[PDB]
């Protein structure tokens, strides 16, 4: 009953579709932040920067599967945020309106508790594992382009990797 | 909090790369019959001789997993006191059997501790740890382990490069 997901750089849409799923989003809350030191690193921006926040609820088939939470740069993406009204996609929307494409990334794979708000939306029970996801992306020109943390349904999901050794 | 970066590493490998000690406790070694799916991942018959090998994983000296092996038992004679000889599975592997892994699946999910899990680990039954089940196969293409490891949710974290 759950997904296998391949880790590769690739989007929730493009995975969903890789599943014969068919994905949807609610926009659960966006805006602007201003990044500390931490993000700021993340981001390549200056502290005190302008970040733009997405937090999204992902789900299949109309199931709620994910909550993701990215951040990108204002300054680097100004009409990023508006342009949302338009791209379900993310990915779609950076390499449409802004010609960036994706080239690697770091992602780190958690298990740990969801916050109460996240249980309800997920409609999980509290006291479920869940994979707790970060994925930081730079694209072909080497620049960070996103930094994401994520609540996928422990219920729902396993990640798969190919191993090879030299 | 180990952060392990994934690869086709051992566990020893994985430790001294991160200055950490490796360290492990054999719980215990044993043969077991094969069902179907465990035939299947390991290419023997369907009523087949497995090794499995219990160890817990130590980073630096706190426990950090409980790591369940299976092998076949026909293809590694004496598989025991190699493992006691060279602590490293995957040393032993290749120094004793000339056996070396060239790619494996790995699959990582969500479980809860039992009550085994939880005596062995130092922490309390149900709470979250990471499951990672491991299928390698060797250079020559033959299947030769499948590994299912729990690690400590509080403790461990999964990295992985992604290229597009
Ligand atoms: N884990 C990644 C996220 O890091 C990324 O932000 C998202 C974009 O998905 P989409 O382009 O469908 O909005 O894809 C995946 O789920
Ligand atoms: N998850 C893997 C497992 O598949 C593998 O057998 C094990 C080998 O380690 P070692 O006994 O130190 O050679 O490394 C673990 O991390």
Same mark, same amino acid.
């Given at each position: 009953?759950? *997904?296998?997901?391949?880790?590769?750089?690739?989007?929730?849409?493009? +995975?969903?579709?890789?599943?014969?799923?068919?994905?949807?989003?609610?926009?659960?809350? !966006?805006?602007?932040?201003?990044? $500390? +030191?931490?993000?700021?690193?993340?981001? $390549? !921006?200056?502290?005190?920067?302008?970040?733009?926040?997405?937090?999204?609820?992902?789900?299949?088939?109309?199931?709620?599967?994910?909550? @993701?939470?990215?951040?990108?740069?204002?300054?680097?993406?100004?009409?990023?945020?508006?342009?949302?009204?338009?791209?379900?996609?993310?990915?779609?929307?950076?390499?449409?309106?802004?010609? *960036?494409?994706?080239?690697?990334?770091? @992602?780190? !794979? @958690?298990?740990?508790?969801?916050?109460?708000? @996240?249980?309800?939306?997920?409609?999980?029970?509290?006291?479920?594992?869940?994979?707790?996801?970060?994925?930081?992306?730079? +694209?072909?020109?080497?620049?960070? *382009?996103?930094?994401?943390?994520?609540?996928?349904?422990? $219920?729902?999901?396993?990640? *798969?990797?190919?191993?090879?050794?030299?």
């Amino acid at each position: 009953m759950k *997904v296998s997901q391949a880790l590769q750089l690739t989007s929730y849409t493009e +995975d969903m579709r890789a599943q014969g799923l068919e994905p949807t989003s609610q926009l659960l809350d !966006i805006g602007y932040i201003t990044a $500390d +030191d931490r993000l700021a690193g993340l981001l $390549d !921006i200056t502290a005190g920067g302008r970040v733009l926040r997405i937090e999204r609820l992902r789900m299949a088939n109309g199931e709620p599967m994910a909550i @993701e939470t990215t951040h990108l740069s204002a300054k680097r993406f100004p009409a990023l945020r508006r342009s949302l009204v338009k791209y379900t996609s993310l990915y779609t929307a950076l390499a449409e309106v802004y010609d *960036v494409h994706l080239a690697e990334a770091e @992602e780190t !794979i @958690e298990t740990s508790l969801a916050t109460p708000r @996240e249980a309800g939306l997920l409609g999980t029970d509290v006291g479920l594992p869940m994979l707790m996801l970060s994925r930081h992306s730079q +694209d072909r020109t080497g620049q960070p *382009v996103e930094w994401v943390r994520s609540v996928y349904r422990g $219920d729902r999901y396993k990640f *798969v990797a190919r191993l090879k050794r030299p």
